[PDB]
């Protein structure tokens, strides 16, 4: 799922 956005580390 996470690969569908762009952002910072969790």
């Amino acid at each position, epitope marked *: 799922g*996470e690969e569908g956005k*762009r*952002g910072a580390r969790g």
Partner: antibody
Amino acid sequence: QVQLEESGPGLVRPSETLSLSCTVSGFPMSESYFWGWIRQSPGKGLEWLGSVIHTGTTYYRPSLESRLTIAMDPSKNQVSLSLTSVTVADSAMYYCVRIRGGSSNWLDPWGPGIVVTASS
Amino acid sequence: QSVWTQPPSVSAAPGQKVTISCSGDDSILRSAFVSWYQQVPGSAPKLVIFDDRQRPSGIPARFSGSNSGTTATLDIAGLQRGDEADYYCAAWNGRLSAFVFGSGTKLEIKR
């Protein structure tokens, strides 16, 4: 393995729209990768413009978000850039990239690049 | 910051090792995976390090990376003449919600 090439005009007039295209070969655009655009002005650094993924989620450089549209067409295996109201400052080498998103944000591969001059 | 800070230049002889730093405000880089790009003049940038320390297939192990959180570092050991290039770090900046590149470092190979 992923093949990318940019196409479009080398010269655009100020205030007109810069339209570039990138053909993606040898890799599915329906996989979990973003497709995007970076530019580099002569003698200067790399500037991220934005990216898109097949679901439609899109990211833009905040300072250009009003002028910039980045889209993709999985049927044609294309990712497009459209930058409106161009000025001299948009003169640059424009690169197509594949981006691994999430928290990774790595760019591989890069197209060979296309030189665009904005001038009258 | 909207550009990561890198030294303008590093210089060394073949076989030797250089390190190139990439810095953001405070510990912002702790929240990001850093990647590094090699740009030989006249060519597109090429990914050499990703997720702080990983190497793409075919990149030799003499390229290595780390991310301290305040600064990220690209090591290039066993320098070869073909290594002359500009090197850029890059990383997502969550405070700006944008992908940011470093200002770039030119590697000169001594002779």
